[PDB]
RNA sequence: GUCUACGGCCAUACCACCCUGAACGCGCCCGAUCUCGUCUGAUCUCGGAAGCUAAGCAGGGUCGGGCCUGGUUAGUACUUGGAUGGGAGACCGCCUGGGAAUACCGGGUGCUGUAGGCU
RNA sequence: GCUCAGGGAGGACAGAAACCUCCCGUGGAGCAGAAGGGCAAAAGCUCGCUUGAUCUUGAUUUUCAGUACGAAUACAGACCGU
C-alpha cells in the first residue's frame, strides 16, 4: 500500500522532477494518457468537454489513472466503442519523498522517492473528452463521476473550441472552406500567407 | 546540546545606531600604489621647478 | 532519410563572425597586438605600415588606429612608378622596393624630415636601420602589418620594408626573411639581396629563356618586348627610378571630372511593387487553371 | 557555344594501397606506387586500435600518392585500359568525383620484381573546373557557387564523351 | 556553510550574452582612461586575466593610476558596519566610461553659456532643476463629439 | 552611381536558389629560372598578362528561413505597501504604486571612418 | 600551419567497423581531473625553437578582525626565451 493523499496534497516544495540528481523513482500508475478512438478526424468529433481545476493542489498519478478508467468505462457504456476520445492533460512529473523509519531519529531525514504526483494550477484543465454534439449529456456525467476520484474542487466546461483545436466552433468549417485550416489527423494545421508561393499554388491545386 | 548556527538579525539595527560613516574624502589623496616609473619622473619634475623660476 | 543540420533552430542559435573575418581579410588575433596602445601613452598614435600584394599591384600605407576607423596618413601604389621609369614588372621585388622607398620619401616630405634623415643612398641590402640625430626631430618609428601572407624568406612585403628602411623609416626588423639568407648556413649574403633589389633574378630568367626558347620567352615576357626593356636596361631602369623618387616624391592628385550621374545598378524594389507582383502571380495562376480544366 | 572558363580538368588522381599490416611488408608496398607514378608516396598511421582485423594505434598500415597535371591523365589511361573503358554508374560520386580499384598491379605496365608480389590499389579522380581553387586560399576564400559545381550526371556524361567509355548499370 | 572562493556564484554574472560570444571588439582597448574619470566595473568571462571580484561587478569608482594594460579604480565597498573606499587593479576589458558624468558636464557648459549670454541685459535665466510641477489649468475641447460611455463587461468563463 | 587598401559598430550585414554586372580595380587565369615549401608548384612562395565574367565579389529578386523592429497577447501573469478583509483551509478579492513573456499580425533587410581610383 | 564531434556519398580484398577523396558541419569536439564559465586563421590538433616554472623590492585583491597562511591581480629594476 501507501500513505493518504492528505500528506502530499498541497504544492509545498519546489518542483523536484525525475533527473540525474533524483534517480531511484518508481514508474507512474498513469502511463496511457489518451484513449477511446484516438485515430479520429477533427470534423467527426465537433463537441469538446473539459474538467477544469479550482485549487492550487498536487493530484496523484494513481488518482489520474483511477479518474481515466472511471470516465473511460462510463463513456464506453454510454456512447460505445468508437464515439469519443479522452486525453488526461496532467503528466505526473513531481517526485514526492518519504523519510522511511524501518531506529534512527531525525539525524539527516531526507526522503527516498515514494512516487510521482501531477502538480496543478487554478483554471488548468485536468482531463478533456471530445465527441459528437449528440453526446453532450454523457461527457458531463463522465467528468462529473471522474471528480469523485480527486481531492479539492473540480469544475466542468463544454468549450467553444472545435474538439482538440485552437479555433472556435463557429469559425472552423468556414475557415476550412476558405483553406486557412488543414485537417491533420486529430488536430488542424493553420497555414498563413507567409511561406513561398509554391505552397499556395499546391494548396489551390 | 545543539545551538543556533548563524543569523544577521539585530545587525542592520546595530550598524545604523552610530550611523554608517563614509570614508574621510579630502583634496590631495596620497600617491601610494601609483606606477613608480611615473612617480619617480613626477618627483624629478617637482625637484626641477626652481630652474625655470625667472621666466615664471 | 537523415537529420537536416541547418535547422530553423541552427539559424536562431547561429552567431555570425566579424565582417572582415567573414569576407576573409583581417586577422583580429594579429590586429589586437599590432594596433592597440599602452594605456600610459594616451592618444600617442601607434603607426603601422600596411603592405598588400594583389595580382597586378602593391599597396603600401601608413595608418594609426582610432575608434571611428584607422586613419591612413600616406599611401604609395605600384601604378605610380610609371611616372618615375618602371613601366612593366609591378608585382616583383624591385617594384616592392621602389613602392616602400616612395612611401618613406612621401611621408618625410609631408612632415618636413626629407633633408634630415636622407637614408641609405647607395643601395646594398646590408643590415641598415635609421639612427635619430641630436637636436633634430626623432625618426618615424612604424611596425610592419604583414597581413595574412605567409612571411617566408624573400616575401615581397620585406622588399617594401627594405625600401622604407633605406628611405628613412625606423622599422624594427632582422635580416632572417630578406633574400640571400641561407637557411642551413644561417648567415646573410647581402649581394643576393642586392641582385633581387636591382631585379637581376628577372634579367637572369630573361637570358635563360632568350638562350633556351625565344617562343617560351614571347609567352612569359610578352609586355617587356612591347616597351623593349632588356636585361642590361634592367639595373639602370631601377637605379634611375630610385633617384627620380628621392628627387620628387610629392603626389599630384588626379583631378575630378563632371558627373552625368547615370546609374548602372538595379534600385531596391518598393513594398507596393512587391505586393502587386504577388497579386499578379496569384491572379495569373487561376487565369491558367480555368482555361486548362 | 560554351564558356571556356567552364571546362572540366582532373584536379588530382588519388592512389592508395591499404595493406593493413606494418614493417618491411609495407616498405615493398611503396615501390609499386613510386614505379607507377614516378614520385615518392607517403605512409598513413592507423587511426585507432581495432584487434579484429589486426591493426593498433599509430602503426603504419597504408601507403598513398596524389598525382596532379599531365601525368594524372597518363596513369588514369592505363587504369581504364585494364577496365576496358567500362565503369558502373554507382562509381560516380554525388559531388562530381569518381573512382575504381583494379585487382592486379602489373596490368598497368610494371614488371614483377620477384617477391615484390601482388598489390591492388584505389584510383580516385577529383574532377575540377577553372576557379575551384578559391575554397583553399589564405585570402578572401568562398563557396564556388551552385551553377559552377559538378553533378553526377555531368561527371558520367564527361566519362561517356572523353574516353568513349560505356557506363553499364550495376 | 557555503564554499568560499573567488568565482562562486559568478555563473550568469561573468558569462557572455546570447550571440555575443567569441572575439572582443577592439574599440574596448582604444578608449582613453585618464586619472580621475569615473568608471563602472563589469567583469568579462572571455578575458580571464585581471578580473574584478564579484563584490565590484556593477559598482562605479574613479581612476587613480593607469599602467600599460590595466587601471586602478577606487570603489566604495560596504562590509558589516562601515564603507571602505579601496584600491583595485582591474584590466580595461572589465571597465567602461560611466555616462553619469556626461550629463553633468553638459549641464555645467550649457549652465555657463546661459551666464556668458544674458548677464548684461537684465533678463534673469533660471538655471536650477525643478521637479515636474503640478499641472496647469487648460480647456479639454470636445470637438463636436460627446464622450463614449464605458460600462464593465459581464463575466464569461474562458478556458 | 561605384570599387580598392586599411577599418569602426559586428546577421537591417547571415543562409538557400535565380537574374544582371559599363570603366578602372579585385579576381579567376598562365607558368616554376631565381626566392620558398610540399608525396604532389593543389595550398604556400616566386616570375608573369594569352584569355574569361564561369566562379569569388558587387547590385537586385523571393506571399523565402533567420535577424531587427512595432502591434497584439494584456493592464493579463507577477509584484511594493495596507487592512480586527473573505475562507475550515488551499488560496482569493479590494485599496495604494509598478508592470512583463510566446503563439498570432504588420514594417524593414547594413550604417559609416580615412586614403586612393572609375564614371 | 591547419580545424573539431557527427553525418551524406564514393572507392581492390574491405564488411557495422583498417585506408583514401569530396561535400555539409556555431562547437553538437578538445582543453589531465569534479562542476560552472570561457575559446574556431584559438585557449583545440600538428610541427619548430626554448626555460618568464629564474633573481629582487614595495603596492593591491580574495577569506577578513579588515589579522596571518594559501592563492591571485597590476607595476617597477635585472637577466633571458620566442
Amino acid at each position: 500500500g501507501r500513505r493518504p493523499a492528505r500528506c502530499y496534497r498541497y504544492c509545498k516544495n519546489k518542483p523536484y522532477p525525475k533527473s540525474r540528481f533524483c534517480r531511484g523513482v518508481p514508474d507512474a500508475k498513469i502511463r496511457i494518457f489518451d484513449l477511446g478512438r484516438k485515430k479520429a478526424k477533427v470534423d467527426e468529433f465537433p463537441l469538446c468537454g473539459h474538467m477544469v481545476s479550482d485549487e492550487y493542489e498536487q493530484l496523484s498519478s494513481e488518482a489520474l489513472e483511477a479518474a481515466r478508467i472511471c470516465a473511460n468505462k462510463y463513456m464506453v457504456k454510454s456512447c460505445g466503442k468508437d464515439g469519443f476520445h479522452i486525453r488526461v492533460r496532467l503528466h505526473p512529473f513531481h517526485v514526492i519523498r518519504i523519510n522511511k523509519m524501518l531506529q534512527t531519529g531525525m539525524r539527516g531525514a531526507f526522503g527516498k522517492p515514494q512516487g510521482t504526483v501531477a502538480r496543478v494550477h487554478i483554471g488548468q484543465v485536468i482531463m478533456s473528452i471530445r465527441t459528437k454534439l449528440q453526446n453532450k449529456e454523457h461527457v458531463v456525467e463522465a467528468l462529473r463521476r471522474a471528480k469523485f476520484k480527486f481531492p479539492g474542487r473540480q469544475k466542468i466546461h463544454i468549450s467553444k473550441k472545435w474538439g482538440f483545436t485552437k479555433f472556435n466552433a463557429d469559425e472552423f468549417e468556414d475557415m476550412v472552406a476558405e483553406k486557412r485550416l488543414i485537417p491533420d489527423g486529430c488536430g488542424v494545421k493553420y497555414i498563413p500567407n507567409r511561406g513561398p508561393l509554391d505552397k499556395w499554388r499546391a494548396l489551390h491545386s | 546540546a545543539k545551538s543556533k548556527n548563524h543569523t544577521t538579525h539585530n545587525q542592520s539595527r546595530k550598524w545604523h545606531r552610530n550611523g554608517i560613516k563614509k570614508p574621510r574624502s579630502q583634496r590631495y589623496e596620497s600617491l601610494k600604489g601609483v606606477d613608480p616609473k611615473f612617480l619617480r619622473n613626477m618627483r624629478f619634475a617637482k625637484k626641477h621647478n626652481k630652474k625655470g623660476l625667472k621666466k615664471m | 532519410f537523415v537529420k537536416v543540420v541547418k535547422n530553423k533552430a541552427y539559424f536562431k542559435r547561429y552567431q555570425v563572425k566579424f565582417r572582415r573575418r567573414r569576407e576573409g581579410k583581417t586577422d583580429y588575433y594579429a590586429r589586437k597586438r599590432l594596433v592597440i596602445q599602452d594605456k600610459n601613452k594616451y592618444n600617442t598614435p601607434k603607426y603601422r605600415m600596411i603592405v598588400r600584394v594583389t595580382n597586378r599591384d602593391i599597396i603600401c600605407q601608413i595608418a594609426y588606429a582610432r575608434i571611428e576607423g584607422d586613419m591612413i596618413v600616406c599611401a604609395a601604389y605600384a601604378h605610380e612608378l610609371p611616372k618615375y621609369g618602371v613601366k612593366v614588372g609591378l608585382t616583383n621585388y624591385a617594384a616592392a622596393y621602389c613602392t616602400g622607398l616612395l612611401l618613406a620619401r612621401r611621408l618625410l616630405n609631408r612632415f618636413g624630415m626629407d633633408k634630415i634623415y636622407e637614408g641609405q643612398v647607395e643601395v646594398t641590402g646590408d643590415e641598415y636601420n635609421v639612427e635619430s640625430i641630436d637636436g633634430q626631430p626623432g625618426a618615424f618609428t612604424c611596425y610592419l602589418d604583414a597581413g595574412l601572407a605567409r612571411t617566408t624568406t624573400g616575401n615581397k612585403v620585406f622588399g617594401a620594408l627594405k625600401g622604407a628602411v633605406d628611405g628613412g623609416l625606423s622599422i624594427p626588423h632582422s635580416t632572417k626573411r630578406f633574400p640571400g639568407y641561407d637557411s642551413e648556413s644561417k648567415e646573410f649574403n647581402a649581394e643576393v639581396h642586392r641582385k633581387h633589389i636591382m631585379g637581376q633574378n628577372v634579367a637572369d630568367y630573361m637570358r635563360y629563356l632568350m638562350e633556351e626558347d625565344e617562343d617560351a620567352y614571347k609567352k612569359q615576357f610578352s609586355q617587356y618586348i612591347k616597351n623593349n626593356v632588356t636585361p642590361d636596361m634592367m639595373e639602370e631602369m631601377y637605379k634611375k627610378a630610385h633617384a627620380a623618387i628621392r628627387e620628387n616624391p610629392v603626389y599630384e592628385k588626379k583631378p575630378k571630372r563632371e558627373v552625368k550621374k547615370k546609374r548602372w545598378n538595379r534600385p531596391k524594389m518598393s513594398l507596393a511593387q512587391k505586393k502587386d507582383r504577388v497579386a499578379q502571380k496569384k491572379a495569373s495562376f487561376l487565369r491558367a487553371q480555368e482555361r486548362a480544366a | 557555344k560554351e564558356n571556356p572558363m567552364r571546362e572540366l580538368r582532373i584536379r588530382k588522381l588519388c592512389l592508395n594501397i591499404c595493406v593493413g599490416e606494418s614493417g618491411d611488408r609495407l616498405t615493398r608496398a611503396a615501390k609499386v606506387l613510386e614505379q607507377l607514378t614516378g614520385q615518392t608516396p607517403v605512409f598513413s598511421k592507423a587511426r585507432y586500435t581495432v584487434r579484429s582485423f589486426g591493426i593498433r594505434r599509430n602503426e603504419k598500415i597504408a601507403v598513398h600518392c596524389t598525382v596532379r597535371g599531365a601525368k594524372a591523365e597518363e596513369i588514369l589511361e592505363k587504369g581504364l585500359k585494364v577496365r576496358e573503358y567500362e565503369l558502373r554508374k554507382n562509381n560516380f560520386s554525388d559531388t562530381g568525383n569518381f573512382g575504381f580499384g583494379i585487382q592486379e598491379h602489373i596490368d598497368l605496365g610494371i614488371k614483377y620484381d620477384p617477391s615484390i608480389g601482388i598489390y591492388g590499389l584505389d584510383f580516385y579522380v577529383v574532377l575540377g573546373r577553372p576557379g575551384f581553387s578559391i575554397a583553399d586560399k589564405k585570402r578572401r576564400t568562398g563557396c564556388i557557387g551552385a551553377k559552377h559545381r559538378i553533378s553526377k550526371e555531368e561527371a558520367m556524361r564527361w566519362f561517356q564523351q572523353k574516353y568513349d567509355g560505356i557506363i553499364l548499370p550495376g | 556553510t557555503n564554499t568560499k572562493g573567488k568565482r562562486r556564484g559568478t555563473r550568469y554574472m561573468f558569462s557572455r550574452p546570447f550571440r555575443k560570444h567569441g572575439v572582443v571588439p577592439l574599440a574596448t582597448y582604444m578608449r582613453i582612461y585618464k586619472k580621475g574619470d569615473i568608471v563602472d566595473i563589469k567583469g568579462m568571462g572571455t578575458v580571464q586575466k585581471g578580473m574584478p571580484h564579484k563584490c565590484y561587478h556593477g559598482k562605479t569608482g574613479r581612476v587613480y593610476n593607469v599602467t600599460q594594460h590595466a587601471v586602478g579604480i577606487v570603489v566604495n565597498k560596504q562590509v558589516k558596519g562601515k564603507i571602505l573606499a579601496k584600491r583595485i587593479n582591474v584590466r580595461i576589458e572589465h571597465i567602461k566610461h560611466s555616462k553619469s558624468r556626461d550629463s553633468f558636464l553638459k549641464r555645467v557648459k550649457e549652465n555657463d553659456q546661459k551666464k556668458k549670454e544674458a548677464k548684461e541685459k537684465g533678463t534673469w535665466v533660471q538655471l536650477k532643476r525643478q521637479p515636474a510641477p503640478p499641472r496647469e489649468a487648460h480647456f479639454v475641447r470636445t470637438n463636436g463629439k460627446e464622450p463614449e460611455l464605458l460600462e464593465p463587461i459581464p463575466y464569461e468563463f474562458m478556458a
Side-chain angles (χ1 to χ4, degrees), chain C residues 141-164:
Chain C
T141 306
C142 68
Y143 308 109
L144 191 83
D145 196 343
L148 305 175
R150 178 61 231 268
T151 69
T152 54
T153 299
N155 203 327
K156 269 177 275 184
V157 302
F158 293 119
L161 196 144
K162 189 61 198 153

Side-chain angles (χ1 to χ4, degrees), chain E:
Chain E
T1 49
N2 268 326
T3 305
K4 221 165 281 188
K6 298 176 173 58
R7 282 183 65 165
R8 196 269 296 167
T10 58
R11 168 170 184 171
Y12 315 98
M13 182 191 261
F14 292 174
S15 59
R16 299 304 294 140
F18 175 66
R19 289 195 290 115
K20 287 194 147 296
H21 294 306
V23 182
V24 191
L26 285 201
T28 321
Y29 301 89
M30 287 189 294
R31 299 212 160 74
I32 317 100
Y33 299 97
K34 299 305 212 72
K35 179 192 83 167
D37 59 65
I38 315 163
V39 150
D40 45 10
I41 312 172
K42 178 182 175 151
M44 197 177 284
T46 311
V47 194
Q48 277 88 25
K49 299 192 62 48
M51 279 172 300
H53 200 248
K54 64 195 187 203
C55 301
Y56 304 108
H57 181 288
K59 310 285 158 275
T60 321
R62 63 174 211 79
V63 182
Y64 83 102
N65 185 48
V66 181
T67 69
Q68 289 147 11
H69 309 301
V71 292
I73 318 297
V74 184
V75 195
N76 285 47
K77 188 193 163 182
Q78 201 191 356
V79 301
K80 274 89 76 169
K82 63 208 192 309
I83 307 164
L84 312 173
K86 53 184 307 208
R87 302 191 133 166
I88 72 172
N89 311 146
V90 61
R91 211 78 105 78
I92 66 153
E93 309 89 47
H94 314 133
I95 281 307
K96 262 197 312 184
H97 273 105
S98 66
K99 277 177 282 177
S100 64
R101 204 61 168 172
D102 295 315
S103 183
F104 173 60
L105 287 163
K106 178 173 174 292
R107 195 155 59 76
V108 168
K109 200 163 201 172
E110 184 265 327
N111 200 300
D112 285 16
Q113 177 64 64
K114 293 291 101 172
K115 226 181 294 175
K116 296 175 210 158
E117 175 265 331
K119 58 94 180 174
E120 72 279 352
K121 295 160 73 168
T123 313
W124 188 87
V125 177
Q126 167 73 112
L127 303 168
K128 295 180 194 272
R129 296 179 300 191
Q130 292 82 15
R135 215 189 300 106
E136 194 187 346
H138 62 116
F139 294 75
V140 180
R141 287 171 310 170
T142 71
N143 289 119
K145 184 75 179 83
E146 276 189 345
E148 186 189 326
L149 190 77
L150 301 170
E151 83 183 33
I153 191 78
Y155 180 81
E156 182 265 326
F157 183 39
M158 267 293 306

Side-chain angles (χ1 to χ4, degrees), chain C:
Chain C
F1 280 120
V2 307
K3 189 151 277 286
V4 181
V5 291
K6 288 191 161 180
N7 193 17
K8 200 172 77 178
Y10 168 88
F11 283 132
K12 276 167 146 288
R13 298 291 324 290
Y14 187 79
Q15 175 182 2
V16 302
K17 284 163 192 176
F18 284 6
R19 192 172 61 97
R20 299 308 299 282
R21 177 58 192 77
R22 256 183 286 124
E23 292 173 4
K25 292 195 193 174
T26 297
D27 196 356
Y28 282 99
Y29 189 84
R31 190 164 210 272
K32 173 165 161 284
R33 278 87 193 270
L34 267 171
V35 147
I36 79 149
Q37 178 70 302
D38 285 3
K39 283 296 105 172
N40 55 14
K41 300 290 182 72
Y42 316 85
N43 296 121
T44 291
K46 207 211 177 183
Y47 292 111
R48 83 183 193 277
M49 183 175 167
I50 303 146
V51 195
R52 300 289 179 275
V53 185
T54 72
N55 273 12
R56 275 168 229 78
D57 213 50
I58 293 183
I59 312 159
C60 305
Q61 285 154 335
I62 296 151
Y64 64 103
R66 300 295 226 156
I67 307 170
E68 303 90 33
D70 65 294
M71 296 179 179
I72 306 294
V73 56
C74 200
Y77 287 81
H79 61 85
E80 305 185 27
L81 304 177
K83 184 185 166 76
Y84 297 123
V86 191
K87 205 60 64 72
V88 208
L90 271 65
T91 67
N92 58 45
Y93 203 97
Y97 188 90
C98 296
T99 319
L101 165 67
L102 177 57
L103 186 61
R105 300 320 302 162
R106 191 162 290 157
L107 185 77
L108 267 55
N109 202 300
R110 280 182 63 174
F111 292 148
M113 316 200 319
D114 62 313
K115 286 174 163 283
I116 313 157
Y117 307 126
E118 284 282 323
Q120 191 89 249
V121 184
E122 314 98 341
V123 294
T124 64
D126 278 308
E127 186 169 354
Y128 188 62
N129 35 40
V130 184
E131 291 282 335
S132 294
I133 320 164
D134 313 283
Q136 312 317 131
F140 188 84
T141 306
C142 68
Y143 308 109
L144 191 83
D145 196 343
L148 305 175
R150 178 61 231 268
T151 69
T152 54
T153 299
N155 203 327
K156 269 177 275 184
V157 302
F158 293 119
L161 196 144
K162 189 61 198 153
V165 152
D166 303 326
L169 264 58
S170 176
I171 304 192
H173 68 102
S174 200
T175 72
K176 285 191 78 167
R177 288 296 171 207
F178 289 147
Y181 185 81
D182 300 2
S183 186
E184 197 180 12
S185 192
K186 302 182 182 177
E187 73 89 12
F188 181 56
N189 194 304
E191 183 52 42
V192 185
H193 197 175
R194 209 189 170 274
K195 290 263 186 290
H196 271 250
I197 283 167
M198 296 327 294
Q200 255 70 38
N201 66 263
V202 174
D204 289 357
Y205 183 39
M206 287 178 75
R207 270 145 182 152
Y208 183 79
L209 295 198
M210 201 183 284
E211 78 181 316
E212 200 181 15
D213 209 315
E214 286 86 323
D215 287 59
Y217 182 72
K218 274 188 73 62
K219 171 170 150 185
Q220 177 64 20
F221 299 97
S222 308
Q223 298 289 113
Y224 275 53
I225 318 303
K226 191 183 171 288
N227 286 110
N228 283 312
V229 287
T230 57
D232 270 336
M233 197 168 288
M234 205 53 53
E235 197 175 38
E236 194 274 317
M237 189 253 289
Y238 286 118
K239 74 204 191 210
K240 179 203 171 294
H242 294 170
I245 283 161
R246 289 182 108 93
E247 276 285 313
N248 187 45
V250 176
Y251 186 43
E252 183 182 37
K253 299 205 71 176
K254 199 155 289 301
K256 249 193 161 178
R257 195 203 172 175
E258 290 91 330
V259 287
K260 288 91 180 165
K261 272 299 298 175
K262 137 176 58 172
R263 214 200 194 78
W264 294 103
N265 305 29
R266 178 166 177 167
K268 186 159 271 156
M269 198 184 277
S270 304
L271 167 67
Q273 279 174 349
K274 277 190 280 230
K275 296 288 273 293
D276 200 61
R277 188 206 263 223
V278 181
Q280 286 178 63
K281 278 179 165 181
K282 290 186 307 193
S284 57
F285 170 73
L286 208 73
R287 187 66 166 187
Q289 193 157 28
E290 60 84 31
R291 265 150 167 76

Side-chain angles (χ1 to χ4, degrees), chain A residues 114-127:
Chain A
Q114 192 203 39
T116 42
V117 73
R119 169 175 294 197
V120 203
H121 293 266
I122 306 174
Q124 183 164 357
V125 179
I126 306 175
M127 291 170 49

